[PDB]
């Protein structure tokens, strides 16, 4: 539900990123990460929680690189 919308938003983030639309990609990454953090906050299972952290960390790493690039300008 919340993970379905996170997937939708993150697919757009990756698409915008591949098109070099950096400010737009960054917002979609932030928004998708927010939703994934909301799913994580509501999850009790340790494997699911740990796997969700890996997914979030991977998207966070990409968005931190985009922000660093935009900040240089």
């Amino acid at each position: 539900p919340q993970s379905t919308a996170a997937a939708t938003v993150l697919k757009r983030a990756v698409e915008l990123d591949s098109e070099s639309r950096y400010p737009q990609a960054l917002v979609c990454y932030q928004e998708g990460i927010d939703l994934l953090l909301q799913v994580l906050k509501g999850t009790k299972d340790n494997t699911k929680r740990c796997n969700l952290r890996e997914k979030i960390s991977k998207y966070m790493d990409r968005a931190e690189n985009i922000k660093k690039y935009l900040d240089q300008e």
């Binding site: 960054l26 932030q30 953090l37 952290r53 979030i56 968005a63």
Partner: peptide, 14 residues
């Protein structure tokens, strides 16, 4: 864990 990632998200939005 959630706090570290939420801090990373807030810094991203600064």
């Amino acid at each position: 864990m959630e706090d570290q990632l939420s801090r990373r998200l807030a810094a991203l939005r600064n």
